[PDB]
Design a protein around this ligand. Structure first.
Ligand SMILES: [Co+2]
Ligand SMILES: [Co+2]
Lengths: 620, 620
C-alpha cells in the first residue's frame, strides 16, 4: 500500500529478528515502545523505507537504548545508549504493573502497615503509579514506581471502593527494592462496596428501553482501501495507529472539485496528563501521563459490535509488539462508521416559495482505552461541511481516597468515608498543519468592541482583529472566551476567489488549563498544559509536547524547549498544539462508575472554499 | 384534564367568543398575541381555571388592550387599555409585513431611488423589519416597520443575493404612510445568483450518500399521555407551546426510586435578539427580537418525516390563534423522539476481571421556525444520567449588503460585491427552578488556584469556592471561562445521603455576550444580553427579560427593573435567566445558504442523587 499503511505483524516480526540478530534483544531486554516512523518530508520519493523506532529496556539495570531499524532493508540504522537521568526513563512496562504489589507483600514496613489496619495482605491490591520527580535524590537514574493500596474483598470486588489512605510505598522496579513506606496515620477504610453489577446495588434492571436500530441497507458511504485509506464525502485520509498515541490521522484532505486539497498533514493526541490537586503527601506526587508514561494505544479495548459501536461499523485491528518483539493484534480496536448528524442547512423562503432542507453526517474514527481506573474514548469526526472535530469521552471508576473527618478543600465525598481527590484530565492535540499545502501561518482572532462616537453614532458597531504569530517566541497563546478568541491557520500563498488566503478556524472549548502552582514539578513537566495554544516550526524529532521520555523526566522537556528555538512560523511548515481538558471535582453521581464527561475542539473552514461545499448534497 | 395540556381549537374559539361577547373584539380588532397562562402558584388549586392572555390591536388606530380571560368561566378577568408610547407597541402582526413593499411601490421617493439604480419596482422585494427606538420623535406611539430592498430577478430567485444598498424606508403600518426614504447613494447591486437548487450552481448532485436507516421495531421508549405529558427513562414533563416562546417545558422531574423529584418548574427561551454591527445608517438601527417582536412560535415550520426528523417520531400539532381569534393548527410543528447517544459508562477492570459498557440515550423535543432569511431550530434534550440540555441551531440565508469597494471592518465579503454585515444571535433561557421543590438558592462556583507553600509544599493543590447569591442586587453575573465558573442551583433544605444540599450545575458555553456600546439603544432594550446570568425572585408578571411589549419599546421594563426590587433569593422560589449566543462574521462558506451553527447550555446533577442514577440501565 502507501507508506502510511498500518504496521503488519510481519514487519513487527522482522523488527524482532533484526534486533536479536544485532544482539540488541537479549533475555534481559524488553521492548518498552515500538512504532513505525512516518515518511520524511518530500514528494517525488517513491523509494519506500519503512523504519521503526524502538525503546529497549534492560531488566538487569544496564542502560536502555533507542534504536531505529529499517524493515525494508533489514538493517539497524541507529542504536544509542540513553542516560535516563539526563533524558528520562522509558515508558512503564505492562509487566512492571504486578511487581509493585508483589515486592510490597513481603516488606515488613508494608505488612506492619496492613496489620495495624487489620487488612489481609492477600486482599490488598496495589496500583503501580508513575513517580514523577520530587525531592528524592536517590531516585535520579533509577526506575521508580509508587503504590497506593486498595482492598479487594473478593475476586469480582471493586477495590476502588476501599482505598487505604495514609499509606504509600516507593519501589525500585529494577533492583526490586522497596525504597520507602510512608504511613502518615490510619484512616478508616471505606466499607460500602461499589459493585455496579451487583443487583443489590443496581436494583431491578429497567425494562423500559425499546431498541433503536441503526442500519445501512446499502452499506456505508466510505471506502477503505490499502487497509487504512478512507474516502468519504470528499474527504480522504489514512488512519494510522501508534502504541503511544493511539489513533493517528494522516493526510486529511478535501476534494474540492478537481483538486485534492490538503488541510491537516497529521492529527494526534500527543499527550494526556491527569494531575491531582490533593496536597496530602500520600497523593501530592500523583500526575499520570496516560499517553507519555503508560502509552494509550497499548491498552486499547477490543470493541464489541452493538455495544461499543452501533450501526454499520468497519473495524481496523491494529498490530503492536509485546515486550519481546512478538506482534500482537488488538482485534476490533478501531471503529469506523458514518453517523447521521441532524440538519445541515435549512431555509423556507417566502419570496421564492422554495423550501429547502438537507441532513448532515459525520465520519467517525474512534478507539477506547483503559489506564487503570479511567477509560477514555478518543473520537475524530469529519463533517460534510468541511468541519474537523475531536472529542474525548472520560469514564471508568474515580480514583479514590478516604474522605477527611471535618471535610476537605481538595477532596469530595462520594460515599460514607469515601473521597475523590480533585484532578484534571488535560490533552494536547498535535496538528501538523497543511492548509492547501505546507506554507501556513497562524493568526489570533479576537472580537473587537467599538465605542459609540464619530463613525459609530448609534454605538452598535463591532469588529474583529487578527494578529499573525510570526516567531515561536510569540506563539504561546492563552484563551479569551470573553472576546471570542479563536486561531486561524491560513496559507498566505493560496487565495480563494475573493482573493483572500484560504484558512481554517480553531474553536476551543476554553476550559481551564493547568491549575498547579507555576513553580510546581508538574507545571514544569507538563508545561504544555499551562497554555491553550502553541505554534512551532515542524521538525521530525519534535513529536510530543512533553518530550520523548516523560517518565521521571525533570522538567522543561518538550514544547518549552522547542519554542525556545524561536523559529520563523509566518508562512512555513508549522504545527499547532492545542491544550484542552476537564477539571474534575467528583460528584456523588460519579460513584460507583462514572457516566461519560466530554471535551474537545474543532476546526471549521474559514474562506477555504469559494462558497458552501455542500450544495451538491441531494435531497435525501 | 391536566392544567398544562396544550390549548385546543375549542378553547381558542371560546376565547374569541368571550372577547366578542365582552365587546372587546369588533371588526377593527386583531389578536397580536394569544396564549394560555400557567396555573397559579401553590398546590391547593380549587378545580381547573384555564386563563388566556391576549394583546388586542386596533387597525383604526385606537389604543390596544391587554386582556386576560377565563375560558373556563366565560369571563374577562381584566382588560386594560395600553399607552404604547410608554409601555411599548404590540408584536408585529403577520399582515403588516406585506404592507411595507405595497406602500413603497407607489411612493415617488422610493421610485426615484429605484430608478436611479435602474431597478424595476415589480422586482424589488422589501424585507419588513422591526424599527426599534432611535431619534425619530414622530415614531413615538406609532407602529413603524423599516424596509430594506432586495432584487428578485424571477419568481424562484433568491432575492438575498441581490441587496440594494444605500437605501432604506420607514413606514407607518397603521396609517399606511411612508414616513421617510433615505438614499445615501447607489451601490452596485450584486449580480451573482444564490440559487442553491440551480444545477448550474450545485453542480451534479452527489450519488455517494448511502442511506442511514434509524428504526424502533417495538416503538419508542417514551409514552405520550394527556396529549403532551411525556414519561421517558425516569423523566416526567409536559410539553407546552406558546406563540411567542415556542416549545416550553413544564414540570421537568425525575423519578428517583419511589419519589418523583422536581428539577425545573418551567424552561423556555424567553427572548432572542439579533443585533447588527454595521455602522452604516442603512442598517445601524437593525436589531430583531424574534421572540418578543415577531413571536417565533407562530412561524414554526411543519416538519417533514425523514427530512426534518429522522427515526420514530411522535409529533404534536399545536394550535394558535390567527389575527381574528380563529384557531389555526401548525401540523407536525413539534418533533419528539429518543436518540442513541454513544457510551454512557464504561470500565474494564483488571483486578475484578469485569468489563462493563452501557449506552446513553437522549429524549429530544424540537421545533424549527423561519423569520425572513433566518431559520432557527430549538432543541431540548433529556439524558439518562439526569443531564438537561438546550441547543439552538442557526441556519437559513445570510442577511446581505453590498461589500464596500475598499473593504470593511464591519462587513465580510461572500461573493463579488456581496457583503454580510457582522451580527449576533443572543438567546435568553428562563429557567423557573424547582430543585426538589421551590426552596432554591444559586451559588457561583469558581475553581480556586493555590500557591505553593505551607500546606501545599509541592504546589499541586487546587480547590473550588462557592458564593451564594443572596439578594437580586448581587445576582447579575458574568462568565469566567478561565476559572471554570459555573452556577449551582441547590435546595438548602433537601440533602442527599451524605448530608449535602441536592443541586444541579449550569454549564455555559461562555460565548461573547452583547457587543454593542453600553450607551446604545440596543444595550438598553436588550439589557439582559449584556450579562451571562441573572437570578430573580419568581413573580407571575415577570415573564420575559425584555418585558411584555418589546416592539419599539425603550428600556424601562424587563430584568433591570425586576432586579431593582432586590428580593431574597437565598432559599426561595427563584428563576435563572441565562444569556447565551453566537457572534457571526459571515464566511464565504455561509453563502448561498448557511450550514447550521449551534450554541446552548446544559445542567448536570450536582449531588442531587445518592449515587449514579443509571446503575439500573441494562446491557445492550
Ligand atoms: Co476525572
Ligand atoms: Co448569523
Amino acid at each position: 500500500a502507501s507508506p502510511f499503511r498500518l504496521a503488519s505483524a510481519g514487519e513487527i516480526s522482522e523488527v524482532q529478528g533484526i534486533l536479536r540478530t544485532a544482539g540488541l534483544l537479549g533475555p534481559e531486554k524488553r521492548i518498552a515502545y515500538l512504532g513505525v516512523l512516518d515518511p520524511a518530508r518530500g514528494a517525488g520519493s517513491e523509494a519506500e523505507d519503512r523504519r521503526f523506532r524502538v525503546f529497549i529496556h534492560d531488566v538487569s539495570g544496564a542502560r536502555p537504548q533507542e534504536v531505529t531499524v529499517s524493515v525494508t532493508n533489514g538493517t539497524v540504522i541507529s542504536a544509542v545508549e540513553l542516560d535516563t537521568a539526563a533524558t528520562g526513563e522509558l515508558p512503564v512496562l505492562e509487566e512492571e504493573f504486578e511487581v509493585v504489589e508483589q515486592l510490597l507483600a513481603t516488606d515488613e514496613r508494608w505488612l506492619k502497615a496492613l496489620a495495624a489496619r487489620n487488612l489481609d495482605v492477600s486482599k490488598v491490591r496495589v496500583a503501580p503509579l508513575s513517580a514523577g520527580v520530587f525531592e528524592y535524590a536517590e531516585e535520579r537514574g533509577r526506575r521508580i514506581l509508587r503504590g497506593l493500596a486498595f482492598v479487594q474483598d473478593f475476586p469480582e470486588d471493586s477495590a476502588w471502593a476501599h482505598p487505604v489512605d495514609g499509606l504509600v510505598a516507593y519501589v525500585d522496579v529494577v533492583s526490586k527494592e522497596v525504597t520507602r513506606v510512608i504511613d502518615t496515620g490510619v484512616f478508616p477504610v471505606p466499607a460500602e462496596h461499589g459493585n455496579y453489577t451487583d443487583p443489590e446495588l443496581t436494583g431491578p434492571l429497567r425494562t423500559t428501553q425499546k431498541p433503536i436500530s441503526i442500519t445501512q441497507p446499502e452499506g456505508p458511504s466510505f471506502t477503505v482501501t490499502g487497509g487504512n485509506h478512507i474516502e468519504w464525502e470528499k474527504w480522504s485520509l489514512d488512519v494510522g495507529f501508534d502504541v503511544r498515541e493511539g489513533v493517528v490521522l494522516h493526510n486529511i484532505a478535501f476534494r474540492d472539485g478537481d483538486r485534492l486539497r490538503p488541510i491537516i498533514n497529521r492529527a494526534s493526541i500527543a499527550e494526556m496528563v491527569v494531575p491531582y490537586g490533593d496536597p496530602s503527601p500520600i497523593r501530592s506526587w500523583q500526575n499520570y501521563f496516560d499517553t507519555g508514561e503508560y502509552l494509550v494505544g497499548q491498552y486499547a479495548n477490543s470493541l464489541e459490535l452493538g455495544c461499543d459501536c452501533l450501526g454499520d461499523i468497519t473495524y481496523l485491528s491494529p498490530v503492536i509488539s509485546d515486550a519481546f518483539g512478538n506482534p500482537r493484534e488488538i482485534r476490533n480496536g478501531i471503529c469506523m462508521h458514518e453517523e447521521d448528524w441532524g440538519i445541515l442547512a435549512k431555509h423556507s423562503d417566502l419570496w421564492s416559495g422554495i423550501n429547502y432542507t438537507r441532513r448532515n453526517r459525520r465520519m467517525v474514527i474512534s478507539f477506547f482505552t483503559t489506564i487503570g481506573n479511567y477509560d477514555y474514548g478518543f473520537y475524530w469526526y469529519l463533517y460534510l461541511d468541511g468541519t474537523i472535530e475531536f472529542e474525548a469521552k472520560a469514564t471508568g471508576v474515580v480514583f479514590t481516597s478516604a474522605f477527611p473527618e471535618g471535610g476537605s478543600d481538595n477532596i469530595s465525598q462520594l460515599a460514607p468515608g469515601l473521597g475523590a481527590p480533585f484532578h484534571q484530565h488535560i490533552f494536547s492535540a498535535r496538528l501538523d498543519m497543511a492548509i492547501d499545502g505546507f506554507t501556513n501561518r497562524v493568526e489570533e482572532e479576537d472580537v473587537v468592541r467599538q465605542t459609540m462616537g464619530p463613525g459609530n453614532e448609534r454605538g452598535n458597531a463591532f469588529s474583529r482583529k487578527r494578529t499573525v504569530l510570526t516567531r515561536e517566541s510569540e506563539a504561546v497563546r492563552e484563551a479569551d472566551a470573553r472576546t471570542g478568541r479563536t486561531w486561524i491557520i491560513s496559507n498566505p500563498e493560496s487565495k480563494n476567489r475573493l482573493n483572500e488566503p484560504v484558512g481554517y478556524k480553531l474553536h476551543a472549548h476554553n476550559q481551564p488549563t493547568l491549575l498547579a502552582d507555576p513553580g510546581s514539578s508538574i507545571a514544569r513537566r507538563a508545561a504544555f498544559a499551562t497554555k491553550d495554544l502553541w505554534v512551532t516550526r515542524y521538525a521530525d524529532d519534535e513529536r510530543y509536547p512533553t518530550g520523548d521520555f516523560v517518565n521521571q523526566h525533570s522538567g522543561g522537556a518538550g514544547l518549552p524547549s522547542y519554542i525556545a528555538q524561536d523559529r520563523d512560523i509566518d508562512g512555513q511548515d508549522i504545527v499547532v498544539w492545542h491544550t484542552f481538558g476537564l477539571t474534575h471535582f467528583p460528584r456523588v453521581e460519579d460513584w460507583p462508575i462514572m457516566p461519560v464527561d466530554t471535551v474537545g475542539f474543532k476546526l471549521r473552514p474559514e474562506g477555504f472554499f469559494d462558497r458552501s461545499p455542500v450544495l451538491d448534497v441531494p435531497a435525501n
